[PDB]
Amino acid sequence: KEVLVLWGVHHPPNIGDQRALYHKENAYVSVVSSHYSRKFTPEIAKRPKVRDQEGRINYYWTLLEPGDTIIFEANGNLIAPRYAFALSRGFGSGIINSNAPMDEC
């Protein structure tokens, strides 16, 4: 059925990480599908420090309708999916932020 696909792109905090990890700079990520054909070109050389981590990462996602076909073109700075999902839509819900514990009723 209509599956959901998750992935990300890693932005190292300097050119050194790019050069020493993916072995070449100017690495693009181009996911393509029937209705999703945008490209990512992550090339950044500095960041602040958050959670004891300089570099940053952008988590994208998409949706695959029945019979569709998604193709991942990349040569660096890619976070390939490792467990995709399989949704069934369902409309009318939303997140509740709460600390109370679970029970049955």
Binding site: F91, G92, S93, G94, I95, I96
Partner: protein, 173 residues
């Protein structure tokens, strides 16, 4: 108190009324009690039940009323969603509170009208056979057994067979 029966010319209620709303107190020779008026209270209870259930059921049901969340760049979207949620809540509060108040008033004068209509019903059935007093009570001129109550609460109070007795008691001397 639009019709002015309850808290009007019937000063106080009765604590012993437990079976029905618009009862009686027949302090006749054979005994006493607080026998209800089954037709009127049944119709009244039916009416209030229709009112309350219409208030409940007409409210349609949908699976969400939750404002979504937005990050620090959709302050337009967050303020718009807050405006929609707050305007819906404001309209609902105004409408619901003005309803609650308005049909609270309608319920009060509907009970007032039920006591009223009952009072004029008994008065029309009795005409001048029984004189009126304060508090919405009555005073039968004729001798009056339990069959009175049978005829009064079934509406079949035949005036003529008790007419002349009342005519005698009008002056009694």
């Amino acid at each position: 108190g639009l019709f002015g029966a309850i808290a009007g010319f019937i000063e106080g209620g009765w604590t012993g009324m437990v079976d029905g709303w618009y009862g009686y107190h027949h302090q006749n020779e054979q005994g006493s009690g607080y026998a209800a008026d089954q037709k009127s209270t049944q119709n009244a209870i039916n009416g209030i039940t229709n009112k309350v259930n219409s208030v409940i059921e007409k409210m349609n049901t949908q699976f969400t009323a939750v404002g979504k969340e937005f990050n620090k760049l959709e302050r337009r979207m967050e303020n718009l969603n807050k405006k929609v949620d707050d305007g819906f809540i404001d309209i609902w509060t105004y409408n619901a509170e003005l309803l609650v108040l308005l049909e609270n008033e309608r319920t009060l004068d509907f009970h007032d009208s039920n006591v009223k209509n009952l009072y004029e019903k008994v008065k029309s059935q009795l005409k001048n056979n029984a004189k009126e007093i304060g508090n919405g009570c009555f005073e039968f001129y004729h001798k009056c057994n339990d069959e009175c109550m049978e005829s009064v609460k079934n509406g079949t109070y035949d005036y003529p067979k008790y007419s002349e007795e009342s005519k005698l008691n009008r002056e009694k001397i």
